[PDB]
C-alpha cells in the first residue's frame, strides 16, 4: 500500500458522513489498492551440505548400476559431430531410443551429435548432477568421464 | 404456424407498456386493433406498431391469413436503462433511470 500510485489524503472525514471510515485509497481493502502479503523478490537458494550432494551423486549412479542401466563406453566410433553418426553408434550399442539416456562425455563433437534427440540429455562430466541422472532411464559415460565421477566422490 | 415482431430499445418503462400489452394478449387481431386505437396510453402507439408488423410478417412471409390472426403471445421485457442525473436540494444528485422495453408480439391462426 506504500508503493501504490495513489495519494495519501483521507477521502472523506472520519465521522458524520454515514459512510465507513477510510484513509487513503491505497489501503488493501480497496479495489486497485495495495496487496497485503504478496510476493516480493526472493532468493530461494540454500547451501546443501557438501557431503550430501557428494553422497547423492554416488547414490544416483549406484541406483542405475544396481538395475544394470549404467554403460561405460571407451570411445564413440564414427561420431564426428553429426546426429546420423550418433544414431548409428547408438544402434550398435543398444541405445535404440526407447529409453532416455544421460550422455556424459568431455568430447564436444559427441555432445553435438547427440544433443537434438528427444531421448538424450547431453552432459559434460564436470556437470554430473543427480537430477539429470534420475530424470533419465539409463546412464552412459566415457571411461574419461567415469574417471571424473570417481574423482568427485573421493 | 406463428409470426412475431420484436420492438427493441423502445424508450418507455416496461411496467407502463405491460398494462397496454395485457389488454391484447389472446385477442383476435381485429379486436386488438380496436382496443389499441382507443386505449388512452402512450404505450398504445408502440404496441400497435409491433402488432401490425407481426401481422404483416404473418401475411407476407408465413402464409397465414389476416382474417384468422390472433395474439397467441405477447410480453414486454426490460432492456438497458438510460441513467440520468436529477439534481436535488443541498447539493445532492439523484440518478433517474429512464427504462427501456423490448416489446414482443406473436400471432397465430385460429382455424375457425
Amino acid at each position: 500500500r506504500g508503493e501504490v500510485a495513489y495519494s495519501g489524503r483521507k477521502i472523506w472525514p472520519q465521522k458524520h458522513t454515514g459512510r465507513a471510515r477510510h484513509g487513503d485509497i491505497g489501503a488493501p481493502i480497496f479495489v486497485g489498492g495495495g496487496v497485503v502479503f504478496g510476493p516480493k523478490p526472493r532468493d530461494y537458494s540454500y547451501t546443501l551440505p557438501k557431503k550430501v550432494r557428494k553422497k547423492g551423486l554416488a547414490m544416483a549412479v549406484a541406483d542405475r548400476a544396481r538395475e544394470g542401466k549404467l554403460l561405460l563406453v571407451e570411445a564413440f566410433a564414427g561420431v564426428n559431430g553429426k546426429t546420423k553418426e550418433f544414431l548409428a553408434w547408438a544402434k550398435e550399442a543398444g541405445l535404440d531410443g526407447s529409453e532416455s539416456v544421460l550422455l556424459v562425455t568431455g568430447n564436444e563433437l559427441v555432445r553435438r551429435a547427440a544433443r537434438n534427440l528427444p531421448w538424450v540429455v547431453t552432459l559434460a562430466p564436470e556437470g554430473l548432477n543427480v537430477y539429470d541422472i534420475v530424470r533419465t532411464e539409463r546412464l552412459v559415460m566415457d571411461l574419461d568421464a567415469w574417471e571424473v565421477f570417481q574423482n568427485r566422490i573421493g | 404456424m406463428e409470426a412475431k415482431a420484436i420492438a427493441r430499445y423502445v424508450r418507455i418503462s416496461p411496467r407502463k407498456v405491460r398494462l397496454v400489452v395485457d389488454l391484447i394478449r389472446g385477442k383476435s387481431l381485429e379486436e386488438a386493433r380496436n382496443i389499441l386505437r382507443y386505449t388512452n396510453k402512450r404505450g398504445a402507439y408502440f404496441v400497435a406498431k409491433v402488432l401490425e408488423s407481426a401481422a404483416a410478417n404473418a401475411v407476407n412471409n408465413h402464409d397465414m391469413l389476416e382474417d384468422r390472426l390472433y395474439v397467441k403471445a405477447a410480453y414486454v421485457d426490460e432492456g438497458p436503462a438510460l441513467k440520468r442525473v436529477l439534481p436535488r436540494a443541498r447539493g445532492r444528485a439523484d440518478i433517474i433511470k429512464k427504462r427501456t422495453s423490448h416489446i414482443t408480439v406473436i400471432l397465430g391462426e385460429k382455424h375457425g
Partner: peptide, 14 residues
C-alpha cells in the same frame, strides 16, 4: 459523491 451535508445536531440529552 464528494460532499456530505452536515447532520442535524442531536436533541440535548443533558
Amino acid at each position: 459523491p464528494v460532499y456530505i451535508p452536515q447532520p442535524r445536531p442531536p436533541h440535548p440529552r443533558l
